[PDB]
C-alpha cells in the first residue's frame, strides 16, 4: 500500500516460546511506546509523547485475546510451527567516527523470524554490558521483525567491537565486527 | 531447535494528503501468514487464507462489531492523526553534514536528522555531479533519527572546490560543506 504515512495502533505479538508478548505503537516505522507487560506500565519512546496517557491494561487484555486465538490456530493448523529465517546483521556508527569523541555503535538485526533473538556486544573477545540498550521488535510488512541494539562508546585506536547475534536461523552465533580505524 | 507458534495483530492506518485519504487495515497473522483482515476500503472482514475463514464468518455475523470497525477509520486513525500533527509530525532534527576522504572517494555523511525527506547533491565547482555518485539507502537508526552517506569518486585537479548540498525540512536554508585538496 502507498501512503504518505503509516501507523500501527498497535503491533500486538504473542508466541508460545517463553511464552512472551509485546505491545507497541509505531508511526512511520518508529516505536512510539511499548507497554511493559510484567510491570503493567506504558513506557514512551519519544519525550514529546510523555504528555499522553495510555492505559496499560488495554495491552494486557489484547495480548490475552492473542493468546486465546493462538491456541485455537495451533490446533486448526495441525501444529504448523513457525519457520526460522536467516537474519541479516549490520553494524555501523550513529555519527562519523572521530577518536576521542563519544559515539554510539548500532547493530541492526533484520529479517527476524520468529521474534526470538539474543543480541550482545563483545570487545577484545569479552562481553560488554555497560552502555548497551535495544529497541523492541519492530514490525515489517512481510510480518518478520527487526531489532536494533546500541552500545555507547569513546572511539579509541586500540579498541574494536563485535555485535554477537544468536538466532535459530543461524548454525552458530553471528559476529559482525566494527573497527575505529 | 525449539518450536514456536506465533500470532500477530496489527491495527494499521494509512494516511495520504493529511486526512483527506485515510485507510484502515487490521491484520490477524498466524506465524507469518495473514489469515483474516478488515480493510476499511472493503467494509467487511475477509479471510485471507482458509485458516481465517471461521474468524471472518463469526466476526461478520456480529453487527455491533462491524459497526465499530467501520467507524474506526475515524475514531482511531483520523483521531490519532490529530495527535501526530502536534507531536511526531512536528519533530525536526537538523542534520549534521560532514565530508571525509575514503583518496579518490569523498564521503558526505548526513547524520541524525528527522523526518526522512532529504536531498543531498554533490557539486564540482558549480556543476552538479551525477555520474560517480553513489548513496547508501536511507538508514533508520531506530531512535527517531536517520542518516544517509553520499559518496563521490573524484579525480581532483588543482583549484577544484567540491561541495555537499543538503536540503531538509528542519533547515531554514540548505547546508553546504566544502572540501578542497
Amino acid at each position: 500500500i502507498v501512503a504518505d504515512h503509516v501507523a500501527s495502533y498497535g503491533v500486538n505479538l504473542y508466541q508460545s516460546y517463553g511464552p512472551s508478548g509485546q505491545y507497541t505503537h509505531e508511526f512511520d516505522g518508529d516505536e512510539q511506546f511499548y507497554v511493559d507487560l510484567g510491570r503493567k506500565e506504558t513506557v514512551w519512546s519519544l519525550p514529546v509523547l510523555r504528555q499522553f496517557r495510555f492505559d496499560p491494561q488495554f495491552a494486557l487484555t489484547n495480548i490475552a485475546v492473542l493468546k486465546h486465538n493462538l491456541n485455537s490456530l495451533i490446533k486448526r493448523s495441525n501444529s504448523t510451527a513457525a519457520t526460522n529465517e536467516v537474519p541479516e546483521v549490520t553494524v555501523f556508527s550513529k555519527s562519523p567516527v572521530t577518536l576521542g569523541q563519544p559515539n554510539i555503535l548500532i547493530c541492526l538485526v533484520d529479517n527476524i523470524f520468529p521474534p526470538v533473538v539474543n543480541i550482545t556486544w563483545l570487545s577484545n573477545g569479552h562481553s560488554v554490558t555497560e552502555g548497551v540498550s535495544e529497541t523492541s521488535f519492530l514490525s515489517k510488512s512481510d510480518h518478520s521483525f527487526f531489532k536494533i541494539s546500541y552500545l555507547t562508546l569513546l572511539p579509541s585506536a586500540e579498541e574494536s567491537y563485535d555485535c554477537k547475534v544468536e538466532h535459530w536461523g543461524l548454525d552458530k552465533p553471528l559476529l559482525k565486527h566494527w573497527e575505529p580505524e | 531447535s525449539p518450536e514456536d507458534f506465533v500470532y500477530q495483530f496489527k491495527g494499521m492506518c494509512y494516511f495520504t494528503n493529511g486526512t483527506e485519504r485515510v485507510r484502515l487495515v487490521s491484520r490477524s497473522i498466524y506465524n507469518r501468514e495473514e489469515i483474516v483482515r478488515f480493510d476499511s476500503d472493503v467494509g467487511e472482514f475477509r479471510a485471507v487464507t482458509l485458516l481465517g475463514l471461521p474468524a471472518a464468518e463469526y466476526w461478520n455475523s456480529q453487527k455491533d462489531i462491524l459497526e465499530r470497525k467501520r467507524a474506526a477509520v475515524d475514531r482511531v486513525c483520523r483521531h490519532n492523526y490529530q495527535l501526530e500533527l502536534r507531536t511526531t509530525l512536528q519533530r525536526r532534527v537538523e542534520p549534521t553534514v560532514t565530508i571525509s576522504p575514503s583518496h579518490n572517494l569523498l564521503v558526505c555523511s548526513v547524520t541524525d536528522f528527522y523526518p526522512a525527506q532529504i536531498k543531498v547533491r554533490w557539486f564540482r565547482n558549480d556543476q552538479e555531479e551525477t555520474a560517480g555518485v553513489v548513496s547508501t539507502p536511507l538508514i533508520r537508526n531506530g531512535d527517531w533519527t536517520f542518516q544517509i552517506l553520499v559518496m563521490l569518486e573524484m579525480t581532483p585537479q588543482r583549484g577544484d572546490v567540491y561541495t555537499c548540498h543538503v536540503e531538509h525540512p528542519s533547515l531554514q536554508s540548505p547546508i553546504t560543506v566544502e572540501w578542497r585538496a
Partner: peptide, 11 residues
C-alpha cells in the same frame, strides 16, 4: 488520548 484497536476472540 491515543486510540488503539482491539483484537477479537477467535470462535
Amino acid at each position: 488520548q491515543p486510540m488503539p484497536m482491539p483484537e477479537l476472540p477467535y470462535p
